[PDB]
Design an enzyme around this catalytic site. Sequence first.
Site, PDB file in Angstrom:
ATOM      1  CG  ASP A  15      -0.333   0.083   2.535  1.00  0.00           C
ATOM      2  OD1 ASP A  15       0.729  -0.533   2.520  1.00  0.00           O
ATOM      3  OD2 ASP A  15      -0.800   0.892   3.370  1.00  0.00           O
TER       4      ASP A  15
HETATM    5  C1  8Q1 Z   1       7.696  13.631  15.763  1.00  0.00           C
HETATM    6  C2  8Q1 Z   1       6.484  14.729  16.020  1.00  0.00           C
HETATM    7  C3  8Q1 Z   1       5.400  14.166  14.858  1.00  0.00           C
HETATM    8  C4  8Q1 Z   1       3.992  14.108  15.417  1.00  0.00           C
HETATM    9  C5  8Q1 Z   1       2.767  14.386  14.672  1.00  0.00           C
HETATM   10  C6  8Q1 Z   1       1.502  14.098  14.642  1.00  0.00           C
HETATM   11  C7  8Q1 Z   1       1.320  12.709  13.539  1.00  0.00           C
HETATM   12  C8  8Q1 Z   1      -0.090  12.410  13.090  1.00  0.00           C
HETATM   13  C9  8Q1 Z   1      -0.862  11.431  14.191  1.00  0.00           C
HETATM   14  C10 8Q1 Z   1      -1.987  10.527  13.607  1.00  0.00           C
HETATM   15  C11 8Q1 Z   1      -2.510  10.802  11.928  1.00  0.00           C
HETATM   16  C12 8Q1 Z   1      -3.762  10.323  11.584  1.00  0.00           C
HETATM   17  O1  8Q1 Z   1      -4.193   9.474  12.366  1.00  0.00           O
HETATM   18  S1  8Q1 Z   1      -4.292  10.890  10.134  1.00  0.00           S
HETATM   19  C13 8Q1 Z   1      -5.969  10.093   9.442  1.00  0.00           C
HETATM   20  C14 8Q1 Z   1      -5.806   9.003   8.578  1.00  0.00           C
HETATM   21  N1  8Q1 Z   1      -7.118   8.497   7.821  1.00  0.00           N
HETATM   22  C15 8Q1 Z   1      -7.298   8.601   6.439  1.00  0.00           C
HETATM   23  O2  8Q1 Z   1      -6.665   9.003   5.781  1.00  0.00           O
HETATM   24  C16 8Q1 Z   1      -8.811   7.902   5.926  1.00  0.00           C
HETATM   25  C17 8Q1 Z   1      -8.852   7.677   4.466  1.00  0.00           C
HETATM   26  N2  8Q1 Z   1      -7.582   6.885   3.922  1.00  0.00           N
HETATM   27  C18 8Q1 Z   1      -7.032   7.225   2.638  1.00  0.00           C
HETATM   28  O3  8Q1 Z   1      -7.527   7.897   1.910  1.00  0.00           O
HETATM   29  C19 8Q1 Z   1      -5.779   6.409   2.112  1.00  0.00           C
HETATM   30  O4  8Q1 Z   1      -6.195   5.050   2.624  1.00  0.00           O
HETATM   31  C20 8Q1 Z   1      -4.624   6.346   2.994  1.00  0.00           C
HETATM   32  C21 8Q1 Z   1      -4.375   6.358   4.266  1.00  0.00           C
HETATM   33  C22 8Q1 Z   1      -4.239   8.006   2.285  1.00  0.00           C
HETATM   34  C23 8Q1 Z   1      -3.358   5.491   2.231  1.00  0.00           C
HETATM   35  O5  8Q1 Z   1      -3.283   5.432   1.186  1.00  0.00           O
HETATM   36  P1  8Q1 Z   1      -2.523   4.168   0.027  1.00  0.00           P
HETATM   37  O6  8Q1 Z   1      -2.858   2.888   1.015  1.00  0.00           O
HETATM   38  O7  8Q1 Z   1      -3.143   4.251  -1.214  1.00  0.00           O
HETATM   39  O8  8Q1 Z   1      -0.991   4.667   0.169  1.00  0.00           O
END
Ligand code: 8Q1
Lengths: 110, 124, 55, 111, 459, 67, 128, 88, 80, 98, 178
Positions: free
Chosen positions: H43
Amino acid sequence: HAFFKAMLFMCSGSIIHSLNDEQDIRKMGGLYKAMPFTTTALIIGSLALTGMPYLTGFYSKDLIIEAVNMSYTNAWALLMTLIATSLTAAYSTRIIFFAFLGKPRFPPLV
Amino acid sequence: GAHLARRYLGDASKEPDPLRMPTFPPDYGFPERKEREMVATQQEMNDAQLMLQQRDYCAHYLIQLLKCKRDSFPNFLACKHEQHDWDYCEHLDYVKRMKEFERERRLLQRKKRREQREAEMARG
Amino acid sequence: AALQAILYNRIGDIGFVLSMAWFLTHSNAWDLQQIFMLNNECPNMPLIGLLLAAA
Amino acid sequence: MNPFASLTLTTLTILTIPIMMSNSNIYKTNLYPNYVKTTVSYAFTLSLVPLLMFMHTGQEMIISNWHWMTLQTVELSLSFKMDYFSVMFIPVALFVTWSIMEFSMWYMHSD
Amino acid sequence: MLKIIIPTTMLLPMTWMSKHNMIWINATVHSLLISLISLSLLNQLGENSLNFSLTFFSDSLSAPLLVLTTWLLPLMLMASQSHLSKETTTRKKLYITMLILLQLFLIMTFTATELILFYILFEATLVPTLIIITRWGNQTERLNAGLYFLFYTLAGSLPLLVALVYIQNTTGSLNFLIIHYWSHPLSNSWSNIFMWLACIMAFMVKMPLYGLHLWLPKAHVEAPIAGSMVLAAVLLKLGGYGMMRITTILNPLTNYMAYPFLMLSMWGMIMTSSICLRQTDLKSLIAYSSVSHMALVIVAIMIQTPWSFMGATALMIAHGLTSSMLFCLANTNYERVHSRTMILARGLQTLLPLMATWWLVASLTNLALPPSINLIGELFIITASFSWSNITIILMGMNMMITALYSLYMLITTQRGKYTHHINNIKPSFTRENALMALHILPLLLLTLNPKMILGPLY
Amino acid sequence: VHIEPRYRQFPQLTRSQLIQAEFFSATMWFWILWRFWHDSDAVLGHFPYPDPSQWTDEELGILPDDE
Amino acid sequence: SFPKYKPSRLATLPATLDPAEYDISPETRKAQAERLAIRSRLKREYLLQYNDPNRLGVIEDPALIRWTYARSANIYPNFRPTPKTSLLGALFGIGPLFFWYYVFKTDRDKKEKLIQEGKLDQTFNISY
Amino acid sequence: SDAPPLTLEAIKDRVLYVLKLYDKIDPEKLSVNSHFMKDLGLDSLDQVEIIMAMEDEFGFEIPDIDAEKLMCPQEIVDYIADKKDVYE
Amino acid sequence: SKMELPDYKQWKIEGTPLETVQEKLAARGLRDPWGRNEAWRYSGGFANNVSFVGALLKGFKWGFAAFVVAVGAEYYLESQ
Amino acid sequence: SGYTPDEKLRLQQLRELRRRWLKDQELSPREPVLPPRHSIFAVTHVLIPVWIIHYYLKYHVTAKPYTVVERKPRIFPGDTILETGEVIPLMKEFPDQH
Amino acid sequence: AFSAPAAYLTHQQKVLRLYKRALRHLESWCVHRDKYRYFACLMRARFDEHKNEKDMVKATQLLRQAEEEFWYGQHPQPYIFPESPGGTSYERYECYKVPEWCLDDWHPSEKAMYPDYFAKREQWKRLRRESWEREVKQLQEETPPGGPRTEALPPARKEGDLPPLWWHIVTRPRERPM
Ligand SMILES: CCCCCCCCCCCC(=O)SCCNC(=O)CCNC(=O)[C@H](O)C(C)(C)COP(=O)(O)O
Ligand SMILES: CCCCCCCCCCCCCCCCCC(=O)OC[C@H](COP(=O)([O-])OCC(O)COP(=O)([O-])OC[C@@H](COC(=O)CCCCCCCCCCCCCCCCC)OC(=O)CCCCCCCCCCCCCCCCC)OC(=O)CCCCCCCCCCCCCCCCC
Ligand SMILES: CCCCCCCCCCCCCCCCC[C@@H](O)O[C@H](CO[C@H](O)CCCCCCCCCCCCCCC)COP(=O)(O)OCC[N+](C)(C)C
Ligand SMILES: CCCCCCCC/C=C\CCCCCCCC(=O)O[C@H](COC(=O)CCCCCCC/C=C/CCCCCCCC)COP(=O)(O)OCCN
């Protein structure tokens, strides 16, 4: 101070050139064995900077601290001088610990 | 430090002031005091060109040390006894200054004690 | 960085020039020997200029 | 004449010779950095001697060799002060510069 | 003095009788010879001036200016011949004739013994400069620039004529020697105040004084290279020379009549140095730097001390040479890229190293690096001002800092960074351009060895 | 002295650099020990520090509060 | 949750902290497409001349000419005498002049009156 | 002097080395042209981690706009070769 | 010249802090797919490194031996 | 995901062209066609400059007053002057607290 | 750097870029490799917690909260590669890059040296001059009437055609030109 400060920059430059022009200590791993002469020179320069007795830095820095202690001087200046004397060893230890000890953190092609 | 804590936190009226000191006469508590003497003359110090701050009562040992440095130039470790003598004389001068400080402190404390005590005796 | 260094050094050079002007105007010399002889009790202006230059 | 003044001025003078030769053929070759380093080392070993003279007798001097201009009562002359500070700082600076140029011959090799 | 004037006049039939392909060579050779001859006036007596005759005299103030003019003419000829290559023979001869007439008027102006002759020649300098600017200028704003340059000068100069004829009527003479030896104090009256203003404002506007300086950016930017060279190097110094000559009879009034001019000069040198920090045109920056330097010269003249006049003379000479060199350096790049915008061509050090060295040396002399004569004059003026008042050091130091700032800003913008990609017509530097820069810069450094030649009579 | 990269292995070492580094570290430590053996007063102090409370009033010259 | 970051003039707001780029509408996408098309057309026009083998010289940029003209020649034709303009001009023009006149006049008057008293300590002051 | 000039074979070998040190990829299965999304069943996060590992391997950063399209080892090798001016 | 990469099979996380990281992650239900890439920093010549105090005391043994030799020479020499 | 076919095709064409250009920047074995004592340094860079300076100082600079000024040497009790043969008397018999 | 940008970034692209930035800043915070690996797997798990979200609004809000968390907890001095836009060697070798058109202004004595190189340069110049017109014609053919919509360029499609606008891309000076 001229002697060992020039030596410290020289050691830092040798380290930088060895590790493909890298200057961040977070990517400097264990060079205590990989760079023995540079490690020895930097350790000697750090001991001279910190006022280890009978080195180059002793004969001037420790006399300066002694004279500052025994003078009609501002109390705050004396306290800040002492805290700076602590911080000197602090960052010297930081340099040695992060640059020469531990495991390698540089790119694989040595 | 203890003297700084005593002066700045406690009653500063009971502690000597380094700027204006001594305030008591030099012959107050002593019956007779001997004047401090010199071994090196003004002309000797002028010819030796020591410094205006090195022309203290320890200047003769400094002159000896500088001469012995000059004669035994290639051997710079040979002038140990002269350096020790100059350091000892400087230490004696510093101890004399500390004695002066303690004498002023005790004299001021005793004077305050006795004058408030005679006032207390007179008020009753 | 080079321009920053030049800027700070000229900030100090302001005080350097102030010291030079004071010494010429009051001691009639720029050389070290005359300045020492004619300034037994040195006022604040030339010393503050020199301090600014050193800083 | 006292060798002190001549040696102190020669130490400063010989450092300018590579600057004069910068337009010569040696500047176009790869031997120039070694030449400059050798010149600086010779300057250091020459400056060592007035330091010895001062450490022996405390010799200090001022040399007003050239008169530049005079404005009324004020005289401006090329004058050098050769007291303890100068005779002690010159050899240290020359030593450090010698070491640093020998280092630069390796560090800046590909420049 | 005729041994200088007559060859300068002979330059005219010599260039009008030359072949179509030999005018530049002949004019340059004989201009250099005339400069060599004029170099002999530097031998000054000390006590008094060299009085050749009733009409002309030479001073320790006039001689460096005369040598500078005679030396500037061949550099002007060398700079002009590149952009005039397509011109007809008659028009090139007319241009050289304008330059020769300007030189003749300048050399006669600096040596006149009497103030009406000085005024006549000092106004006569206007016509050749106006013709050069309005005929061989490149842009359409040259007409407006010429109108500004003419009328700003004349509005100040006419009251000077009235004051001069009134003074000659009241005193009986205007010969500078009689003027100096029979000097009497000016009382505190409105009539004397307006006489002072009429004697001062013309030289004020020629410097130019801040607030009367608007003609200078227009004229210096819109003129051809030779016109800018002569405007910055020599024509700005006419005001300073006139002030030094005329303030002899203005005492003791100058003691308080100079306050607004000192205030204007100091604050305006600060303002123009600041203006140089935000300029999109390369020539305007040089023009405004000239304004700042001349403001410092105005302060030096106003305070009326020997050190001030010495510093003012040194600064005039050094500024003339440095400004001419900077204008030539800008003109080379303009000829390359046909635009005056500073950020159009960048990183020229990668393409032109020797021209970058010339740029660095010119920028270093502009910021008055020791022991150049620029700093000699500036330091003398600053010390004199400090004697006048200790608070002047704040403004002097601020001006020094800003001057270093915009000088190195211009150097970094034009020479450093990466080259502009699409610009691909930057040819290697010609021998003529490098020789012109060298001939500008070498006398500057050589004058350091003998600073007393340009320090003036008060030395 | 020709040394080649090794790609994730400890770099090749020569004897001369190791012996030089060890020699100079030993030189520094030996110098420190020799100085401390011969000039221990420079670090530990040499002259005793007097205690002002150990001073009698007869040698310090103050009267016994009754005059 | 975590402490918030507030922007200012000299420290602007990061894109990832901008609510505008997370509240998207079709008109916003159309605007972005229009901006990209304008940029692409300008890039093509520039690159057709940049890569031309025949072309020799400096490629004139209309935008740079507009910037220089606006900064230099277009300012006065668009100037109006306004209370804001008049007050700012008067202040920044004559305020500093009178301020410095007052400072220097006061200092020199003090110095001269102190000279008349015979008390300035002008010993060794032979250069001025 | 400095490091010897880089070659295409070395780049490809190092890329395959880094990919064979990845746990979610079969060493036998992996090939230079093996697609990441299609053939190895990976992925986008795994591709991001692979790009970061390549940056750590070669000591240089690849911009996100360009790293998005490196979906096989051959593309990574080509990108590295073209950026460091490696032609043989 | 013309060196080649070592075998990738040898890089194993057992006996290294990467094994501790792996077991602490398995205690959470997670796995690290990048340990064998990092194993070379612990496998070979970088297996053991000295401490800070031991690094400061680099050439203490030889220097102390030389100092003891010198002081014994001083003991045995001034008896003449 | 990944390149478009046009993107990849153009990239490989540009790659071939760029690699050919880089190969063509390489030099043939003849490209730089060039058209047609132990103590020398110590005698020309040290001995000659000190000869000129010593001559310049000894006969020109020291030919005018107050050009080279030395601080007078220090004198201690017991010293003997070279010029006058004077002997400086010793210094007052220390109390000798040995 | 090499790819034509798009009009906007999708939610997926923003999510991956935030993931990479968070990983890099965590590596900056976690100097050692094992601790960095542990916390990077923890970050990956926390990131996959919302992998299969279908509500775009809540996904956008999660992205905004994650960006706020990253900004509050970012490293003030993150590690930067030396040649990166923030690195200590970013534009170090830009002063050594000289454009290829400068070789035409060389003196004939300078070109007497290096004859084969200049013959091959003549070959390259003939190639460019003989391909330019076809490049222009192809660009005119493959372009919509309302101007180009993106900064993408088409490849060559004929037998002896070269991709349009290739000269200044192929003839880059170098990355280490001296
Ligand atoms: C060191 C200090 C840094 C800390 C900063 C904070 C970091 C962030 C913490 C938490 C972040 C989250 O939860 S962010 C929320 C994440 N949720 C989603 O994105 C929902 C929909 N998903 C999609 O559109 C795709 O599946 C995708 C995921 C893009 C993959 O794509 P591929 O599979 O096609 O590559
Ligand atoms: C060498 C270095 C550089 C030097 C040169 C550069 C600097 C100098 C030259 C350039 C700057 C000077 C410009 C002079 C002003 C030119 C005005 C102009 O052209 O108007 C045409 C222009 C076109 O006429 P229009 O199209 O028929 O009129 C339609 C209006 O646009 C429609 O507008 P509206 O109806 O919305 O507003 C109009 C109305 C309402 O106006 C307003 O809303 C704004 C208020 C304006 C008047 C009062 C000022 C309020 C704020 C400041 C108040 C004073 C503060 C304290 C000042 C001293 C502090 C120590 O007017 C008034 O109510 C004013 C009544 C007067 C009351 C105060 C009079 C004070 C006289 C001066 C006091 C300060 C002396 C200097 C102290 C220096 C100490 C060292 O009219 C205007 O738009 C401007 C009207 C407002 C003028 C206010 C002027 C204030 C600036 C100070 C003037 C004194 C300097 C000049 C000396 C000679 C005076 C006889
Ligand atoms: C943009 C730059 C342009 C150039 C700038 C030129 C500057 C010209 C300014 C001239 C400097 C001062 C002029 C005269 C000196 C004093 C002026 C006056 O204010 O002082 C008082 C004068 O008192 C009153 O103020 C009278 C003057 C009042 C009328 C003048 C109008 C001023 C308003 C400002 C108008 C702007 C002028 C410039 C236009 C461009 C002194 O009091 P008093 O001791 O009793 O008189 C002395 C004269 N005596 C001896 C003959 C008796
Ligand atoms: C381009 C900008 C430059 C502007 C400069 C203009 C300022 C010039 C200075 C004033 C010009 C007129 C001066 C008159 C000539 C002086 C001769 C003289 O001294 O005669 C006076 C005469 O004095 C006058 O008449 C002066 C009155 C002013 C007439 C014109 C006024 C115009 C505005 C004047 C103020 C502006 C001047 C300075 C402004 C500078 C530019 C802003 C006294 O003579 P008597 O009558 O015999 O008196 C003694 C016996 N009872």
